[PDB]
């Protein structure tokens, strides 16, 4: 059946511009619109507009018509009613601003053939994340957490580790150097000032399992080629390494 594929997910400086690119394939019909939507990084789901690629005609939501240009690769070949067809579509987001940070979807739209009418959106693209800040590419700060002056005993026990100061979100974080994945937990993301990322990672166990194994945490960050493998032992006053 039909699919939409849309290429690249990005971060760019405020006042610069992007052109999120879509390709549509495998449908039986020849007159659909390709229509653009955004999902806000908190909550909400916004109508932007669409194009009908056989005509190159475009129209917009009244809250976007100043900022963005929707456009397409033109035309269609045939009246044959069963042979292949494909289309490509774009949103030119000029002059990026902080709140333009979102996931953008293309979707196949039947408005030009449900008679001529407004419509639901029938098939959706991969969803491409776009982000806006004046910050720069960097590797993480990678600090361990540890025990401090407390009974350090009874019920649930844990040690944990922290990651911060990295740019773009794809850190890969894991425990035990590729072992014992049960009882692992993460607080996947939050944004620190100017848009640098932070993550908290833990393993949680019964009381007697705290002082009794090599706890090792693994951190890697593809956008900076950074790698860190290290232990998470007591470090408050009872300075410990084994």
């Amino acid at each position: 059946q039909v699919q939409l594929v849309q290429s690249g997910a990005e971060v760019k400086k405020p006042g610069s511009a992007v052109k999120v690119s879509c390709k549509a394939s495998g449908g039986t019909l020849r007159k659909y619109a390709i229509s653009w939507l955004r999902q806000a990084p908190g909550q909400g789901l916004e109508w932007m507009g669409g194009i009908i690629p056989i005509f190159g005609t475009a129209n917009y939501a009244q809250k976007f018509q100043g900022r963005v240009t929707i456009t397409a690769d033109e035309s269609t070949t045939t009246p044959y009613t069963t042979t292949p067809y494909t289309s490509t579509a774009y949103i030119e987001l000029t002059s990026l601003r902080s709140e333009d940070t979102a996931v953008y979807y293309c979707a196949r739209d039947l408005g030009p053939l449900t008679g001529y009418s407004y419509s639901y959106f029938d098939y959706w693209g991969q969803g491409t994340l776009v982000t806006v800040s004046s910050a720069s590419t960097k590797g993480p700060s990678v600090f361990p957490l540890a025990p401090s002056s407390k009974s350090t005993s009874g019920g649930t026990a844990a040690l944990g580790c922290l990651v911060k100061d990295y740019f773009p979100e794809p850190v890969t974080v894991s425990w035990n150097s590729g072992a014992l994945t049960s009882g692992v937990h993460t607080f996947p993301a939050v944004l620190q000032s100017s848009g640098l990322y932070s993550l908290s990672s833990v393993v949680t166990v019964p009381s007697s399992s705290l002082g009794t194994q090599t706890y090792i945490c693994n951190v890697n960050h593809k956008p900076s080629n950074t790698k860190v493998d290290k232990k998470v032992e007591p470090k408050s006053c009872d300075k410990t390494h084994t």
Binding site: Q43, G44, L45, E46, W47, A61, Q62, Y105, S117, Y118, S119, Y120, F121, D122, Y123, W124, G125, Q126, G127, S141, F143, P144, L145, A146, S148, S149, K150, G155, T156, A158, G160, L162, H185, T186, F187, P188, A189, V190, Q192, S198, S200, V202, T204, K235, S236, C237
Partner: protein, 213 residues
């Protein structure tokens, strides 16, 4: 303008129960209304293409109904893969409006969070900084509360928050906050704690620590 609304912001149900998601619009849209599903982190999926009419590849559990201002999606025998976000959308007007989005979540018995708090390690402090981190962990419902004690006084305008989503095995949930300081204020303040509250707790299960001990 057409305002679109969904009745619960989130609702929780057992697998094999019947869901009854319900929508209201400002003045009649009169059909021309869709519903969608969104698996976490995935693109949306269409459920119904008009108020009474089911989409392609929808496995009979689902139905639509509605008229004028009032609309609903019913799910019969809600499966462990049907736990997702759900949206209405009108297409009766040139502003094509999606509803606010309703999560459906796996019902459970109440459980209280076990508690943790942690210090800065030496590398933060050699870098001129300190951060104090807490957990309210492995609990239900998703509805605990946190704030920060420093020299036993409340201060929290520095702080961040984050959560771990529902355990796919267990529905259980987790919450964290971080307090943060420059090295000079970390040396000033002598004791730190995270205050604790939950729907299943009568009083804080507070834990505390002293600076550099």
């Amino acid at each position: 303008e057409i305002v679109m609304t969904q009745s619960p912001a989130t609702l929780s149900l057992s697998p094999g129960e019947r869901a009854t998601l319900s929508c209201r619009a400002s003045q009649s849209v009169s059909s021309y209304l869709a519903w969608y599903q969104q698996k976490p982190g995935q693109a949306p999926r269409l459920l119904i293409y008009d108020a009474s009419n089911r989409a392609t590849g929808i496995p009979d559990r689902f139905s639509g109904s509605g008229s004028g201002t009032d609309f609903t999606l019913t799910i019969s025998r809600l499966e462990p893969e049907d736990f997702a976000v759900y949206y209405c959308q009108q297409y009766a007007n040139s502003r094509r409006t999606f509803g606010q989005g309703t999560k459906v979540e796996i019902k459970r018995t109440v459980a209280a969070p076990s508690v943790f708090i942690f210090p800065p390690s030496d590398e933060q402090l050699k870098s001129g900084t300190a951060s104090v981190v807490c957990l309210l962990n492995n609990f239900y419902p998703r509805e605990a509360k946190v704030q920060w004690k420093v020299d036993n006084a409340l201060q929290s305008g520095n702080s961040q928050e984050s959560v771990t989503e529902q355990d796919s095995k267990d529905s259980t949930y987790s919450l964290s906050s971080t307090l943060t300081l420059s090295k000079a204020d970390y040396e000033k303040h002598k004791v730190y704690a995270c205050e604790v509250t939950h729907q299943g707790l009568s009083s804080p299960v507070t834990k505390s620590f002293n600076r550099g001990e």
